[PDB]
Design a protein around this ligand. Structure first.
Ligand SMILES: C=C1/C(=C/C=C2/CCC[C@]3(C)[C@@H]([C@H](C)C[C@H]4C[C@@](C)(O)C(=O)N4CCc4ccccc4)CC[C@@H]23)C[C@@H](O)C[C@@H]1O
Lengths: 10, 237
């Protein structure tokens, strides 16, 4: 439920 | 000061040098500052950019990538604004109580940030925190350790695995304690570790005030329009 934050992880 | 902890300090220093630009070149990309919530589009862009940098720093913290994807998100949501206030100490100056980022233009004082609403209830204690953090005269090695310890906190609400988080923080805390004894000479090191954990307690109340400010301001859609999608996702519901 955090698309951008998850993508900034990897 | 062991093999393992000199490795940790080297990693965190490099991680910081890759996620904090002391020349502030990317500020041109932001929406322009105007000095109504005149400055919010610019500051929202500054915060949003800084969250990306905080995430980049956090990923390089030795032991962080071994956490769950879900625990990593919990740690970054609660810690993002705190690390932003920590890392802003580098630009903060005590000549005029302002964050100086090259021009001004890109320098921010209490009048720049506390004009609207009840935001002074956050800005007054935040400036005092900046003065208090600045008077510690931290080594850069201590600056990056404190940010990493701030991020990997086992008491954040919503943490699933906490023992591993505590294990990662303890190895960072024991690196900071051992660094102060071996590398920070008296009198500047006097209770320095206790004064740093104290600043972690100041961040908690600044974070709590921040959540109340953001919730009130985001609740008005007119102002929520001016934010960024990342800011809304992280400072959430
Ligand atoms: C993030 C960095 C910097 C931070 C600098 C500052 C000085 C200006 C005010 C900053 C940007 C603070 C923000 C305004 C918090 C803002 C952002 C937000 C959304 O978290 C919020 O609700 N705030 C407080 C309420 C508010 C709303 C509208 C206007 C003013 C306040 C938090 C960190 C501060 C500056 C540089 O050192 C780079 C570094 O990465």
């Amino acid at each position: 439920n955090h698309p951008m934050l998850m993508n900034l992880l990897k | 000061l062991s093999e393992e902890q000199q490795h940790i300090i080297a990693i965190l220093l490099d991680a910081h040098h890759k996620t904090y630009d002391p020349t502030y070149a990317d500020f041109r990309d932001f929406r322009p500052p105007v000095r109504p919530l005149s400055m919010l589009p610019h500051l929202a862009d500054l915060v949003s950019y800084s969250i990306q940098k905080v995430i980049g720093f956090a990923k390089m913290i030795p032991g962080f990538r071994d956490l769950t994807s879900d625990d990593q998100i919990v740690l970054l949501k609660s810690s993002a604004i705190e690390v932003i206030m920590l890392r802003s100490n580098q630009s903060f100056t005590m000549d005029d109580m302002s964050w100086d980022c090259g021009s001004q233009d890109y320098k921010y004082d209490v009048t720049d940030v506390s004009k609207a609403g009840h935001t002074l209830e956050l800005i007054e204690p935040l400036i005092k925190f900046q003065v208090g953090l600045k008077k510690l005269n931290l080594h850069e090695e201590e600056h990056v350790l404190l940010m990493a310890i701030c991020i990997v906190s086992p008491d954040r609400p919503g943490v699933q695995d906490a023992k591993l988080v505590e294990a990662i923080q303890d190895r960072l805390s024991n690196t900071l304690q051992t660094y102060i004894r071996c590398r920070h000479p008296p009198p500047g090191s006097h209770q320095l570790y206790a004064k740093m954990i104290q600043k972690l307690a100041d961040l908690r109340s600044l974070n709590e005030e921040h959540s109340k400010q953001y919730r009130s301001l985001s609740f008005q859609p007119e102002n929520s329009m001016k934010l960024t999608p990342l800011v809304l996702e992280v400072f959430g519901n």
